[PDB]
């Protein structure tokens with residue numbers, strides 16, 4: 001058993017509604033107003049073909065920027081300097097206000113929600129995961145602290161290989177609804193998490209998407225809110241965003257916290273703006289100054305043994321669901337496969353959003369090109 | 385085989401992407417911008433509890449109206465007199481701009497798209513279905529004309545019982561993704577349609593949801609557009625709507641034309657406004673004056689042998705995906721189970737939208753109450 005979870009609607013029984021019950025009472029009052037949560041659905045446009053390129057200022061310093069964006073399969077690109085949008089690009093077929101999957105940039109949003117609850121004293125990072133989710137007893141999350149989850153410093157038997165059909169990535173996806181279920185698969189994301197094991201060691205960085213979903217589970221146990229609602233209440237609804245975000249949900253309504261958020265490029269930039277404003281957003285404080293300071297400060301460098309990341313960023317690290325370059329600019333970024341970044345450049349008070357669709361989830365090739373663009377654009381923003 | 389269908393995106397292979405392939409190239413460029421079409425998804429609200437009742441004018445004539453709306457599980461209710469919203473109600477927990485499932489009011493929208501294509505001379509109602517969809521040869525739709533589909537005048541072995549777990553309604557839903565698939569079920573909506581049989585007789589009204597999905601299939605074959613896009617291009621994008629509508633899609637991306645559209649009450653009223661304006665909408669003409677005239681005129685009364693409908697509306701009929709009361713007011717309505725109506729009152733140049741969630745799909749009890757409210761509100765709009 002995975003214990004108590006937030007009901008899909010007020011008074012809902014556990015796991016209700018399902019695909020076979022949503023038309024029946026009492027479920028249908030909720031379901032008829034939220035059917036996209038149950039059944040795949042398409043937008044029918046209220047609006048009756050070419051790329052939009054408004055790179056403007058940085059164009060003089062980076063003449064070939066649009067070509068470099070094309071070469072990295074860029075769908076949306078936006079630079080926010082202070083409060084001003086100073087450069088934008090959207091590929092043909094993608095509108096400025098269209099939403100785009102964030103992949104693991106979603107993790108940085110989840111970490112922010114956790115941070116807000118730490119500020120409220122509802123989560124203590126020093127406490128074991130099992131203090132908040134007892135049902136993870138007997139799993140790899142039995143022993144580690146919430147901070148070690150936040151920092152991805154738990155050794156786990158989870159092969160985070162995005163291409164291997166047999167990897168835990170795919171099983172994770174089948175459990176949550178991103179992929180077709182097999183018989184014998186865990187019923188939902190919570191159950192999948194309880195199946196994970198490890199050798200018990202901690203302290204070394206191991207990127208594992210399951211960690212973020214454990215954080216979201218903790219958020220639910222501490223607030224009593226569905227993660228989807230907690231993500232709105234503690235973050236999204238304070239941004240003065242143009243559009244709702246969306247997040248995929250599994251068959252219990254649990255949001256795919258580690259990778260399933262979609263939003264517009266401009267709205268994602270509002271998250272970066274909040275970070276560079278010390279944790280304050282138009283709708284109120286999201287996280288404490290201290291939390292933001294710790295994100296910008298980085299994690300333990302010695303924990304970061306990922307050769308690929310450190311080849312590019314020798315003094316890099318990871319903390320609280322953010323990647324920290326440790327470079328001379330102090331760049332920090334949310335990062336997702338296929339080329340998603342929420343990139344912070346504190347030196348110039350700027351945020352860079354790049355949302356892409358590389359053919360491959362992650363390779364040194366795309367990694368080098370992507371980071372080259374983000375660094376060049378950052379430097380182009382420097383006072384001269 | 386069900387023949388050629390509009391690709392989910394430009395250049396897509398048949399049936400691509402699937403739940404297991406959408407992350408791979410070339411699918412992922414499209415899928416990352418449209419993930420809700422593949423995986424159930426929840427809105428993360430950008431906005432930070434009680435019913436809104438602004439019944440206003442008609443309140444004096446119908447003092448107990450709000451109670452009557454509550455008693456019929458009303459979620460949204462809106463009266464448009466001319467171009468003016470003169471009464472509104474939304475239950476606690478449902479916002480004025482929230483979308484609501486239309487159930488078979490969706491059919492009236494599909495019929496409108498067909499009507500537009502008839503105006504363009506791309507569909508001839510007198511022609512057999514097989515003129516446009518040859519693959520329906522050998523099925524119950526082999527022989528009948530497109531008009532007989534529009535008018536629901538084909539005898540079909542399809543038990544339209546919304547509660548019986550064993551009825552064709554459920555198989556239809558399993559084929560399309562509204563319900564959990566069983567082994568042996570048709571793979572998609574098109575395949576399900578090809579399995580339908582009948583005794584070959586025509587001319588008598590038989591309400592069958594499959595008919596509308598055949599119409600949507602015809603729309604796709606004649607335009608080359610996904611039904612979702614055709615619904616936008618020929619109708620929704622001409623309404624000057626506040627929000628996109630949505631429609632559920634099956635595993636090929638085919639919209640659930642007969643029941644799967646959701647939209648706001650105010651936007652649905654724009655469809656009624658278009659009908660009462662002779663087929664013209666803010667964005668241009670949607671259908672011809674003649675088409676609208678034929679809808680308002682009704683179908684053959686003798687074909688209408690449904691005792692339930694005619695008990696309430698003795699001179700009632702059905703044509704072109706609209707129910708026609710044949711009453712002294714000439715009321716016509718789109719109708720969906722659990723209490724959805726797009727109700728036209730030409731006498732007062734008014735449209736009534738009622739979107740509800742009755743516990744039961746359809747019973748004489750709810751039918752009597754629902755129609756009593758719509759008729760009383762219509763009469764309350766009369767000049768005195």
Ligand SMILES: NCCCCCC(=O)NCCCCCC(=O)O
Nearest residue numbers: 103104209259308309335336337
């Ligand atoms: N479970 C399916 C979706 C999971 C998303 C994974 C993801 O986006 N991972 C990001 C990896 C970034 C690696 C950065 C680096 O090594 O330099």
Ligand SMILES: NCCCCCC(=O)NCCCCCC(=O)O
Nearest residue numbers: 487488593643692693719720721
């Ligand atoms: N296939 C699942 C959804 C199908 C929707 C069916 C629906 O909305 N039907 C409307 C029936 C109206 C009957 C009106 C009357 O008999 O008076």
